[PDB]
Amino acid sequence: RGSMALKRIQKELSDLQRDPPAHCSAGPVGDDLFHWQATIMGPPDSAYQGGVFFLTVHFPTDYPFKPPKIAFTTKIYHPNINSNGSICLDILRSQWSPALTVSKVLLSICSLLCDPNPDDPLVPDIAQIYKSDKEKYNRHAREWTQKYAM
């Protein structure tokens, strides 16, 4: 990182809360500005509402040029996310730009939770249930939300 990605982080933080998401939160864990942690609240009108999800954000030494290493610590019944919390979002590498911020990624996942990507499964069966029948999908998620995110 040198001192640049590092300042990039500071900027990412000082600006992160100038206008706080009132729903999500992220920041450096302990004395490591390259090791962050975040918390997302299930959008009130989504299957994951009322739940608290923990995320671990790892900043690449070459940031902001490369995307941040983030994982879902809290169990979540989502087709684009698996048993180890790995998240597969387009902007995480396939369509990522230095411009985008960690904040951005938050809202991205926030909407991703609401509107998932079925043909892009990380877990085929949960992606198949969504597509074939969301009515059932939107329950499992609730069951998991209060059993893993309460």
Tab-separated table of C-alpha atoms in Angstrom:
chain	number	residue	atom	x	y	z
A	1	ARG	CA	0.000	0.000	0.000
A	2	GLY	CA	2.837	2.296	0.863
A	3	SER	CA	1.023	5.362	2.134
A	4	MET	CA	-1.396	5.830	-0.665
A	5	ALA	CA	-3.874	3.005	-0.386
A	6	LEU	CA	-3.640	3.829	3.306
A	7	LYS	CA	-4.718	7.443	2.792
A	8	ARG	CA	-7.291	6.004	0.399
A	9	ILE	CA	-8.647	4.106	3.382
A	10	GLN	CA	-8.684	7.159	5.651
A	11	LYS	CA	-10.528	9.061	2.926
A	12	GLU	CA	-12.846	6.061	2.557
A	13	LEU	CA	-13.591	6.280	6.280
A	14	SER	CA	-13.745	10.024	6.907
A	15	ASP	CA	-16.100	10.212	3.932
A	16	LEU	CA	-17.772	6.915	4.826
A	17	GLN	CA	-19.583	8.586	7.736
A	18	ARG	CA	-19.884	12.221	6.547
A	19	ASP	CA	-23.219	10.953	5.335
A	20	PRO	CA	-23.913	7.748	7.454
A	21	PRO	CA	-26.097	4.902	5.785
A	22	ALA	CA	-28.307	4.766	8.959
A	23	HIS	CA	-28.553	1.046	8.065
A	24	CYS	CA	-25.067	-0.232	7.384
A	25	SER	CA	-21.757	0.345	9.124
A	26	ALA	CA	-18.128	-0.444	8.402
A	27	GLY	CA	-14.830	0.492	9.978
A	28	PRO	CA	-11.303	-0.660	10.899
A	29	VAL	CA	-11.127	-3.513	13.396
A	30	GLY	CA	-8.651	-2.570	16.095
A	31	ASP	CA	-5.487	-0.823	14.913
A	32	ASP	CA	-5.632	-2.170	11.344
A	33	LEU	CA	-6.966	0.209	8.696
A	34	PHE	CA	-6.463	-2.579	6.153
A	35	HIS	CA	-8.625	-5.001	8.117
A	36	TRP	CA	-12.224	-3.780	8.386
A	37	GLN	CA	-15.553	-5.142	9.554
A	38	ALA	CA	-19.068	-4.144	8.581
A	39	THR	CA	-22.671	-4.725	9.567
A	40	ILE	CA	-25.688	-4.741	7.276
A	41	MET	CA	-29.331	-4.628	8.365
A	42	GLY	CA	-31.838	-6.602	6.312
A	43	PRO	CA	-33.912	-4.202	4.195
A	44	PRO	CA	-37.236	-3.931	6.097
A	45	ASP	CA	-39.188	-5.187	3.090
A	46	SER	CA	-36.867	-8.122	2.391
A	47	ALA	CA	-36.669	-11.753	3.473
A	48	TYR	CA	-33.653	-10.886	5.626
A	49	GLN	CA	-35.267	-8.063	7.593
A	50	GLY	CA	-34.579	-7.514	11.276
A	51	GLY	CA	-31.354	-9.465	10.944
A	52	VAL	CA	-27.783	-8.398	11.658
A	53	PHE	CA	-25.083	-9.548	9.239
A	54	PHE	CA	-21.355	-9.221	9.929
A	55	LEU	CA	-18.850	-8.690	7.112
A	56	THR	CA	-15.061	-8.767	7.188
A	57	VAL	CA	-13.363	-6.385	4.759
A	58	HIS	CA	-9.710	-6.883	3.809
A	59	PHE	CA	-8.040	-4.104	1.843
A	60	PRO	CA	-5.620	-5.035	-0.952
A	61	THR	CA	-2.132	-3.513	-0.657
A	62	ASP	CA	-2.691	-2.056	-4.134
A	63	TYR	CA	-6.021	-0.411	-3.293
A	64	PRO	CA	-7.965	1.422	-4.531
A	65	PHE	CA	-7.011	-0.076	-7.902
A	66	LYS	CA	-8.080	-3.596	-6.986
A	67	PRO	CA	-11.313	-4.566	-5.218
A	68	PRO	CA	-11.590	-5.209	-1.442
A	69	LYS	CA	-11.619	-8.745	-0.003
A	70	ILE	CA	-14.956	-9.094	1.800
A	71	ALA	CA	-16.664	-12.124	3.314
A	72	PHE	CA	-20.017	-12.739	4.977
A	73	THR	CA	-19.441	-13.889	8.569
A	74	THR	CA	-23.140	-14.266	9.322
A	75	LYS	CA	-24.965	-17.259	7.839
A	76	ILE	CA	-27.373	-16.161	5.121
A	77	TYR	CA	-29.723	-18.065	2.843
A	78	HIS	CA	-28.728	-16.382	-0.417
A	79	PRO	CA	-27.983	-17.927	-3.857
A	80	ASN	CA	-25.039	-15.595	-4.532
A	81	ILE	CA	-23.432	-16.448	-1.188
A	82	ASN	CA	-22.269	-19.771	0.290
A	83	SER	CA	-21.505	-21.683	3.463
A	84	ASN	CA	-18.207	-19.832	4.050
A	85	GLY	CA	-19.693	-16.390	3.526
A	86	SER	CA	-17.896	-15.867	0.227
A	87	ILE	CA	-19.797	-13.308	-1.855
A	88	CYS	CA	-19.994	-13.337	-5.646
A	89	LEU	CA	-20.857	-9.859	-6.847
A	90	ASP	CA	-20.035	-8.517	-10.302
A	91	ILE	CA	-18.479	-5.318	-8.957
A	92	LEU	CA	-16.201	-7.349	-6.688
A	93	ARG	CA	-13.854	-8.059	-9.611
A	94	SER	CA	-15.752	-8.559	-12.844
A	95	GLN	CA	-16.996	-4.947	-13.046
A	96	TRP	CA	-14.997	-3.142	-10.414
A	97	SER	CA	-13.555	0.373	-10.695
A	98	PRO	CA	-11.202	2.428	-8.459
A	99	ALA	CA	-14.027	4.969	-8.308
A	100	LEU	CA	-16.390	2.688	-6.387
A	101	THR	CA	-16.116	2.798	-2.585
A	102	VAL	CA	-16.525	0.241	0.177
A	103	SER	CA	-19.717	2.169	0.966
A	104	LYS	CA	-20.961	1.539	-2.555
A	105	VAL	CA	-20.293	-2.178	-2.198
A	106	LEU	CA	-22.493	-2.129	0.897
A	107	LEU	CA	-25.590	-0.828	-0.858
A	108	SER	CA	-24.728	-3.166	-3.722
A	109	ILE	CA	-24.924	-6.209	-1.452
A	110	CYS	CA	-27.888	-4.622	0.329
A	111	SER	CA	-29.871	-4.617	-2.909
A	112	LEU	CA	-28.312	-7.940	-3.893
A	113	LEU	CA	-29.974	-9.423	-0.814
A	114	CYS	CA	-33.321	-8.033	-1.970
A	115	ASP	CA	-32.838	-8.812	-5.658
A	116	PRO	CA	-30.455	-11.806	-6.096
A	117	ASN	CA	-28.828	-13.143	-9.277
A	118	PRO	CA	-30.210	-16.661	-10.021
A	119	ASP	CA	-28.288	-17.670	-13.199
A	120	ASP	CA	-25.164	-16.632	-11.334
A	121	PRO	CA	-25.524	-19.178	-8.440
A	122	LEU	CA	-22.752	-19.934	-5.809
A	123	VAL	CA	-25.265	-22.420	-4.415
A	124	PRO	CA	-27.271	-24.079	-7.280
A	125	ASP	CA	-30.140	-25.419	-5.157
A	126	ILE	CA	-30.980	-22.122	-3.444
A	127	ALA	CA	-30.640	-20.409	-6.821
A	128	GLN	CA	-32.953	-23.001	-8.333
A	129	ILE	CA	-35.533	-22.482	-5.589
A	130	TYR	CA	-35.479	-18.716	-6.102
A	131	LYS	CA	-36.035	-18.926	-9.856
A	132	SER	CA	-38.461	-21.853	-9.810
A	133	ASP	CA	-40.265	-20.671	-6.635
A	134	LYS	CA	-39.367	-17.549	-4.633
A	135	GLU	CA	-42.418	-17.977	-2.475
A	136	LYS	CA	-40.559	-20.781	-0.695
A	137	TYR	CA	-37.172	-19.069	-0.993
A	138	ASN	CA	-38.346	-16.004	0.949
A	139	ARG	CA	-39.129	-18.189	3.958
A	140	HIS	CA	-35.972	-20.219	4.336
A	141	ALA	CA	-34.138	-16.909	4.372
A	142	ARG	CA	-36.410	-15.654	7.144
A	143	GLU	CA	-35.922	-18.872	9.109
A	144	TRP	CA	-32.157	-18.448	8.726
A	145	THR	CA	-32.362	-14.731	9.488
A	146	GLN	CA	-33.800	-15.273	12.967
A	147	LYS	CA	-31.690	-18.370	13.576
A	148	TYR	CA	-28.391	-16.864	12.429
A	149	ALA	CA	-28.769	-13.071	12.447
A	150	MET	CA	-30.849	-12.254	15.526
